[model samples]
Target chain A: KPKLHYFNARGRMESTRWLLAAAGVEFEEKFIKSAEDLDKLRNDGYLMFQQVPMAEIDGMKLVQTRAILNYIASKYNLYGKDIKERALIDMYIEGIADLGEMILLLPVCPPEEKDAKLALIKEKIKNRYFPAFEKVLKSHGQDYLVGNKLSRADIHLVELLYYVEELDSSLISSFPLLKALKTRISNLPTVKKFLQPGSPRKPPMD
Target chain B: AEKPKLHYFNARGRMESTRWLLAAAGVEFEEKFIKSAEDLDKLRNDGYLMFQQVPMAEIDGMKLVQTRAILNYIASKYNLYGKDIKERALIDMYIEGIADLGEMILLLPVCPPEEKDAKLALIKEKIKNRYFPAFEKVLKSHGQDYLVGNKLSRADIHLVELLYYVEELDSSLISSFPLLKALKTRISNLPTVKKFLQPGSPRKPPMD
Candidate 1:
């Protein structure tokens, strides 16, 4: 059994944990305070990498969220079915990751301007993201993000939708297609169970 | 809908380029605020969403890492990789160069002013001395318009976006490299790209 080193928050580890849960895999969840726990990781040279919600698979020590997720997904046979679909999934994952990178900057703007910035972001999501996603979803008619069965890409997108919901609930109503997709993801029995209370919560209150 | 799922982190520095790319790509993702070390600490302990580190994506049920890998992978998927292999190789070379610059630019946020100046000075000296001339030869060989194929690739998008970052970090520094500047402008105005760039859309901040 993999002794997963994860905290309370759902961030990078959420998708990984959910992926496993969705597949009915079991692992240990280690909860710790990031601040007080810094010394062990830093002394171990994880500081440049900044933090660890790492997955330790006996012989393997994985860091970097995507790398770890892919590695685990590969092990559990959730990666993808074929080359084209694999490539497509990889692409979607990357594109989605790119979008995530952009959102990380919303706070630094002048506080007064944050709302406008957020609104603009919302609009962009509606126009650009939603359309592209709608195209992908329509291509497969809700059959996971890529491939026939549920794969990592599906997990990636579903987790992302939930992220938006937490940040602002109005989002689902704001974009029908994406919202529909979110509902579809949330409706998954495994996903719903994982999201149920007493799962994990964001740590270190802001 | 909701909040846009993707969560990116980086001291409002290099991530600005990524921000422009997303805004220009016109997609929605959760925009996280990591202005101070405290914010980073929290994000780190909690993860990117409140659990991992800065700038990790929680899509569907998968977690992704490696920014460049993610960008390139997405580019390939979105038909942004390039038309073919030769084009992709050029894009790769171009991206590697831009990445080199990106790494240099990151120092601006954390390094002391004098130290930052020295590091950038080293970079400028290197760019002028070895990197740019070689890059110029490649661009010149590729022809007057694009670095890879005749059409725009993610390389072009990356260059334009990176130029936006580098220039925003310090406009004057970029001036020393003129060809790079010209390439940046040319790519920014593409009809496909133009369709995406909303004025209200977030972009890299202008040099202060």
Candidate 2:
């Protein structure tokens, strides 16, 4: 049996699931409720030896979300066409993870400060980051991030475009190219099949 | 010469750094967003499997699944990985450590207000004891204005942004991580990044 287990939700599991799903790989997904239950699974010997988002590869269980994504992406040839492209994708992934962390803070933060944080994020999107990305898109024409192929960097950008709109419609509008890219990725067939409308998936979280 | 086309997601969250990295390098890219289920489903089916939940990035035409990998990819593209192997590793560890604490801090959104005091306290205690000092060590080790090398790197921008983000969430939240604060200020005030900061850069949320 293929050894893979994820807590589900979009947090850390979605990327791996996408990798597996796109690759047509089969694995078990045990979605649970609450951090308490997640903790329980750990305490109950199921994940005692592991830290979760765990992938048992030849009996070796690995923890760490980025590593797992990297492993799976590399395996599926989704990372990039070559080593240099892979490195670039890795960098973007790291940056996105940082942003992801900040975004999640929205749901848990006090009401008074939440919007301010998001505002700062929005400014950064316009003044500092978008101009740069616009340059890259212009340089590469309409193909991809690195070496002009469909690599993990492209996938990350696709997912993040949706995240931006959810963050706030206005914020996303500032970067037209980015908005278009999200539209491009969202219209894929394989990706459409993966989401079973209203059907619960693993890694359920708030 | 024309810059590469990078379709950044419309929001200001994860894709910001990629945009920044590209901007810093004087590169250009095409940016976009996904506003509807139709947009989402189309991308997911085409090859963007991770979009089932929310917020992913696209480049050229390929889709990257995770967050960090994409940032690192940009860093590598811009030669921001560092001057040498050890530098890269140090950058990796420092950046990853910050990312870990960020993950912990993000849990605040889903928590009830009544429970926040305890949660914040735990985070302060845990972070002050370990993650804070670790960040301090990274600053001290670099022995310079920036986190990795002589020139500014994406890690520096991210570190400062994260520090700003946390404090923006709660001003008092940063009192415990003094060195981190100092380093954040140190990096934020840098000439290259300073111009990007507007007068009201430090605000509460998007609406205001």
Candidate 3:
């Protein structure tokens, strides 16, 4: 089992939890409550970047969000089959990540600017980001994003969908394909387990 | 696989990392520079770019975008990723932090005149304090020639590329990080990388 070190909150580790739970891999987490806790991990020398969301798996400490995700995705065979398929998966995940980044920064937005920030994020998610994703799902006519199979790209997309819906449940009302994708991925036996209340799937940002 | 075709502006903004990866991997490629806004529009209109962005590569019979995606594919295909899953994870972790600093440097050219000083100052501070110190410790801890697996990988290549970029900011930047200072010379002397450093290569100069 991988030992995760990060804050008690989801922040970035939520995605790692999602990947592990979806893979049916059980892992333990150690949370950081103070600057000293974080600095001690750095001093003890587990994290390569001196950063959190570090996973101690395979007897090696892995930091960097993408690095941890990529390792888990590949180990569990969610990445894709070939180089071409992997590239498609990467491209899609990058786009999904672009939107997730905006929402990730929301908790830090100035109180006075939160409404406008939320408005713009909602706008970009629907108009700019979801359109390309919806277009892919529609044109390809696939249940999943890449190669007609469940992949890390699909997992990430569904994760972002839940995050976006937290901001506004009706924001994705128009994108029929994404709605279907959200259903299919969220219904996976492994994924459904993650959606349960007691699982590590985190609540929306404050 | 057919030769990869890269489309980007005639600058070292993003595509340079791919250039370094391909060069270090001994893979040759062709370029289709987007000389104007219209040129990029054509690529986007033709559906050659997903996410409607440039720095896209036509390789393995697929149109690949997202800078990291292109480089990851190239690195994996060339055996530069790692020998196993764990090593790849290590390389990926190291490369991500390296790219974080490199990204600050990449944005230098486009920074507003008033903010350029502040931006450059942050870049220097990060290189010296947060980023480089970590890498320096990694190099010292392992006593290995490369960052991972005792062999050349994407992490080392990307770090060396940033090494040169930061050198342009200040030659003395790497002086304190002795292992990194030695790494620049070591990676620079590779036959293919040596060829890349000479004139007439596709390596773009610093953008205006």
Candidate 4:
């Protein structure tokens, strides 16, 4: 089982948890309660960037959210099968992460800027991101984002949907394909279990 | 296969790292510089950029946006990524660390003049205290010439670019990390990278 080290909030670690659950993997959590805890991890030589979202998996101490996610996705076969497929997945994941970074940083955004930021976030999701994703879905007419199969890209998009929908429930009402994507991914057996009570899914705290 | 088409501003901001990765892999590419708002508008209108942004690389018959995605594609395609999952995991972690610092340096050109000096100082301090020391430890731990797999991967290529990019800000940034200094020298001396370092190459000078 992988033991994750992160703060008690969703933040960056939530996506990793989501992917792990999607992969049907059991995992443990070791929360960071203080600055010293983070420092201790760094001093112990686990946190390479002196950052959180570290995981002890495959007997290796992996930090960096994307790197950890990549390893897990690749290992669990959630990543695509070949170089071209992986590139498409990487492209989609990178786009998803650009929007994810904004949504994740909302808590630290100044109160005065929060409303404006949320407005900007809503605008980007609707006009920019949703349109782009909708086109991809429409063009390929596939249930999944890439390769007509469930992948980390789809998993991460569903994760992003959770955050943005927290911001505005009506956000994806127009993008039916994205809504369908949410439905399909959220109902997967392992993913469905992750949503039930007692699972490690963190609520939207910010 | 056709040469990859890279579209970006003439400056080194986001596309430069991709350029370095491609060049170091011995892959040739063509550049379409975005000279005006009109040029960018046309790219968006023609649907070249997925996110309607520059620093887009047209490769493998896809217009790949997002610097990280393009770099990953090039790294994987050119066999610049590591051999297997664990080595790749290590490469990704190291690349993320370098990129963590690289992102800050990329934005320095547009930083408010009032905050520029302070930001540069903080970045330099971070180089010595945080980033460099971490990489130096990695180099010393393996006692290997490369960051991962004892071979030239995108991590080494990007690290060399960053070492020069930071040294542009401060000459002595690599001085304390002798291991890092040697690593940079080793990567920079590669035939492909050495050629890119010379005067005639398309490598853009540092941003204003």
Total backbone collisions for each predicted model: 34, 126, 0, 0
lDDT of 4 at B20: 88
Compared with the true structure, all predictions reach lDDT values of 0.60, 0.60, 0.88, 0.89
Tens digit of per-residue lDDT, candidate 1, span B1-208: 3433445543355455455555445566565565687876675555333213345545434444446544644565466667754445446545665666667766666777768778878776755554555455556775667766666566667767656655655576566666777777777776545654546444434444
Model 3: CA > 4 A from native: A110-120, B110-118
Give lDDT: candidate 1, residue B97.
58
Residue A143 miss distance in model 3 (angstroms): 2.1
Error of 3 at A125 (Å): 2.4
> Local error of candidate 3 at A45, Å?
1.5
Q: Candidate 3, residues B89-149: lDDT per residue as tens digits?
A: 8888889998878877877877989999988888888788889898888889899999888
Query: Fraction of native contacts in model 1?
Result: 0.03
Q: Against the true structure, what is each candidate's TM-score?
A: 0.51, 0.50, 0.94, 0.97
Error of 1 at B172 (Å): 24
Question: Whole-model lDDT for model 1 versus the true structure?
Answer: 0.60
Q: Model 3, residue A47: displacement in angstroms?
A: 2.2
Instruction: Compare candidates 1 and 3 on TM-score and give the better one.
Output: 3
lDDT of 1 by residue, A11-53 (tens): 5566678777766677776665766676676566432233566
* TM-score of the second chain for every model: 0.73, 0.75, 0.96, 0.96
Q: B43-142, model 2: which lDDT tens digit per residue?
A: 6566443323334545544455456656666677678767654455446545665676676665666688999889888777656565555556656776
lDDT of 4 by residue, B1-208 (tens): 8899999999888899988888898888899999999999999999887887878988878888888888888898888899999999999999998899998988887898999999989998888888998899999999999988888888999888989988887887788789988998888888999999998888998654
Over 4 Å off in model 1, which ranges?
A34-36, A45-50, A104-113, A174-177, A201-206, B1-208
